[PDB]
Amino acid sequence: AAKIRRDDEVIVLTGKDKGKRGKVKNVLSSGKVIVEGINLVKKHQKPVPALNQPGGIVEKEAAIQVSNVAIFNAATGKADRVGFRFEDGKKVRFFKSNSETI
Amino acid sequence: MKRTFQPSVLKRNRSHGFRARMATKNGRQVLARRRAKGRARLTVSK
Amino acid sequence: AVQQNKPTRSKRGMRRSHDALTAVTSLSVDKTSGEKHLRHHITADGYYRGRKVIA
Amino acid sequence: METIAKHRHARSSAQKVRLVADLIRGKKVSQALDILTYTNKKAAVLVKKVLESAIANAEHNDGADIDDLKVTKIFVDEGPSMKRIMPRAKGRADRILKRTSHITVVVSDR
RNA sequence: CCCGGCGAGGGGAGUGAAAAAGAACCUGAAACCGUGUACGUACAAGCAGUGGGAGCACGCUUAGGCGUGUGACUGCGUACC
RNA sequence: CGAAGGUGUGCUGUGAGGCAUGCUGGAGGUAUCAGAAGUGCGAAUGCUGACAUAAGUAACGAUAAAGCGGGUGAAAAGCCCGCUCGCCGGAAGACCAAGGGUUCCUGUCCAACGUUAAUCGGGGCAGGGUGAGUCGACCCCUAAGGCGAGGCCGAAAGGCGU
C-alpha cells in the first residue's frame, strides 16, 4: 500500500518551503504530489482567441517529490512515520511515535 | 544510346519472384538466408 | 598549369589592395522641393531643375 | 552609451559584405544613410536595415537623440556553410559551398 | 513593448543559483577568418634564424636601476625523413 | 570557503619532468610502498572528420528574338491582362501501348529545391477529383516452351518423359 494519500495533512521536510503545511490535492504515478499553497511558480501564458481566454502572468503549483513531505501528527505537533497492521479483518495505518490509528 | 536496364514487370516476376524461388531447392536456401539476416523485403514481388 | 607552392595570406592581401569601393562625392538639392538627388537625374517625386515632369 | 544590433545567418559571403561595411566606419548616421542609399550592391540593403534597427533601439530603450549618434563599431564574421553536389563531365561529382555571415553594428553618442 | 515584409533576425522587460545554461542549448582545445592598440616597413637581393646592437613605447623605482613589446644597421648561415 | 578538464604567470632539476598561484568550470580526485599493461607518433601515394589555396578566377547546357502600356506587390527583364514581332507545322500538333504512380484541379506560403530575382512552379501544407451488360482485364481455345500421377534412369542431391 501507499503511506501518503489524497486529502492528507503534511509538513514539508526539504527545500525552500521547509516547515510549511498543506493538504494533498492529487497523486501522480511518477512519485510526486501536488500540495495546496506549496511550491509556486510564475508562468507566462499566451492568449488564445478560442475558449475566450486572454494571456498573462499566472501563479500556480508545481509537483514535489513524495519523500520530501511527511504526515503531520496534530496531537504532538510534529512530523511522523507510518506503519501498517490488521485490526478486525482489514488493513490500517498507524503512527509510530505513539502507536495510534489514523 | 541504349543502356542495360529495360524494365518489364512480367519478366521481373518470372525471373526473381516468390514462386520461382519456392520452385527449386536452392531458391529456398536464398529465402532461408534472407530470413536469418532479417530483411524487411524478401523478394521483388509487391 | 598549376602552382608548385601554396601562396601566403600576405600575398592575398597584396593582390586585394586594389579592390576598395568609392563613395559618391556629394548630392544635389532641387531648387523648388528641396530634395536630394544624383546630379543630372530626376528626384524620387518627379522633379528636375525646379519643374515637375512626371505625375 | 553604446547600442548594438545584429543580423545572424545572412545569405552572402563575408568577403562581399566587408566591401560595403568599410564605407561607413566612423561616420555620422545621417551621412552613412545617405551613402548607403546610392550604392548599387546587394549587401547595402542588408547593412542599411541593421543600421536602422540599431538607431531605433537607441531611441526606444536608452533615450538617445538621433542628431548626436555615430557609427562607433562595425564588423562581419563568417557563419556555417551548406554543402551541395554538382555533376561534371564523365561521371565525376564536385562539391559546392554556400556561405553565410553574421553582421554587427554599434552606435554611440560619444 | 520596439525596428522589420502581419518575415528571417535582433534589442529591452520577466523566470532562474547561472541565459556567452535560449532549444544550431554541459565543458568548449587546434587548424582557419576578423576588429582595436604599440613598434617596424616604399634605393632594397637568397632555408628567414643565430651572435652583436641604436632608437621608440610602456610598468616598478631605493631617482640607483631593472623588467616587458618592437627592432634600423652588421659577422656567420643551402629544410626534415 | 570550489574536484577533474581549459588558458596565463612565477620558480625549480643534467634530461624525460615537477611545484605554487590568477581567470574560466561546476562534481569529483587520490599521497606512500607494491602489483598488471590496448603505455608515449611527423612521415607508411596510412584511416575518419573539419578547414585552407588557386579566386571572387572558369562557367550559368543548342545563335528560334524580342519591344512597350496597365495590374498586384516591401520589391517586377522573367508572374497576370492587352497590342505588335519572331520560330515549328509528316512536327517542336493530336491520341495511345510499355514504364512511372498523384506529378491532375482549387486555396494558401517562399526557409530549403529552381545553375540569377521570384508575387511563379512538376517545391511545402490542406481540401477535392477516376460512375460501364456493349471499351479492356478476368473468362472459353490453343503456338514456341514450362510443369508433370503412375513410369524409365541415376552414390545422395536429382535427369527425362505418358
UniProtKB/Swiss-Prot annotation, chain A:
Gene3D superfamilies: 2.30.30.30. One of its GO terms (cellular component) is cytoplasm. Pfam families: KOW, ribosomal_L24. GO terms for biological process: cytoplasmic translation; ribosomal large subunit assembly; translation. InterPro entries: KOW, Rib_uL2_dom2, Ribosomal_uL24, Ribosomal_uL24_CS, Ribosomal_uL24_KOW, Translation_prot_SH3-like_sf. It comes from the Bacteria. Coiled coil: none annotated. GO terms for molecular function: large ribosomal subunit rRNA binding; structural constituent of ribosome. Keywords: Ribonucleoprotein, Ribosomal protein, RNA-binding, rRNA-binding. SMART domains: KOW. Belongs to the universal ribosomal protein uL24 family. Part of the 50S ribosomal subunit. Might contact the SecYEG translocation complex when it is docked with the ribosome. One of two assembly initiator proteins, it binds directly to the 5'-end of the 23S rRNA, where it nucleates assembly of the 50S subunit. It is not thought to be involved in the functions of the mature 50S subunit in vitro. HAMAP family: Ribosomal_uL24_B (MF_01326_B). This is Large ribosomal subunit protein uL24. It comes from Escherichia coli (strain K12). The gene is rplX.
Curated annotation (Swiss-Prot), chain B:
The keyword Ribonucleoprotein applies. One of its GO terms (cellular component) is cytosolic large ribosomal subunit. GO terms for biological process: cytoplasmic translation. One of its GO terms (molecular function) is structural constituent of ribosome. The keyword Chaperone does not apply. NCBIfam families: rpmH_bact. Belongs to the bacterial ribosomal protein bL34 family. This is Large ribosomal subunit protein bL34. It comes from Escherichia coli (strain K12). The lineage of its organism: Bacteria, Pseudomonadati, Pseudomonadota, Gammaproteobacteria, Enterobacterales.
Swiss-Prot record, chain C:
Keywords: Ribonucleoprotein, Ribosomal protein. GO terms for biological process: cytoplasmic translation; response to radiation; response to reactive oxygen species; ribosomal large subunit assembly. GO terms for cellular component: cytoplasm; cytosol; cytosolic large ribosomal subunit. The keyword Nucleus does not apply. It comes from the Bacteria. It holds the Pfam family Ribosomal_L32p. Part of the 50S ribosomal subunit. Contacts L17. HAMAP family: Ribosomal_bL32. This is Large ribosomal subunit protein bL32. It comes from Escherichia coli (strain K12). The lineage of its organism: Bacteria, Pseudomonadati, Pseudomonadota, Gammaproteobacteria, Enterobacterales. The gene is rpmF.
Curated annotation (Swiss-Prot), chain D:
InterPro entries: Ribosomal_uL22 (IPR001063), Ribosomal_uL22_bac/chlpt-type (IPR005727), Ribosomal_uL22_bac/org-type (IPR047867), Ribosomal_uL22_CS (IPR018260), Ribosomal_uL22_sf (IPR036394). L-tryptophan binds at residue 90. The keyword Oxidoreductase does not apply. The keyword Ribonucleoprotein applies. One of its GO terms (biological process) is assembly of large subunit precursor of preribosome. Keywords: Antibiotic resistance, Ribonucleoprotein, Ribosomal protein, RNA-binding, rRNA-binding. One of its GO terms (cellular component) is cytosolic large ribosomal subunit. Gene3D superfamilies: Ribosomal protein L22/L17. It holds the Pfam family Ribosomal_L22. Signal peptide: none annotated. Changing residue 8 to C: In strain: SK1048; decreases translational rate, tRNA binding and subunit association at 44 degrees Celsius; does not alter 23S rRNA or uL4 interactions; not erythromycin resistant. GO terms for molecular function: large ribosomal subunit rRNA binding; structural constituent of ribosome. It comes from the Bacteria. HAMAP family: Ribosomal_uL22_B. Belongs to the universal ribosomal protein uL22 family. The wild-type allele (erythromycin sensitive) is dominant over the resistant allele, and is also dominant over the temperature-sensitive allele at both low and high temperatures. Part of the 50S ribosomal subunit. In TnaC-stalled ribosomes forms part of the binding pocket for L-Trp with the leader peptide and uL4. This is Large ribosomal subunit protein uL22. It comes from Escherichia coli (strain K12). The lineage of its organism: Bacteria, Pseudomonadati, Pseudomonadota, Gammaproteobacteria, Enterobacterales.
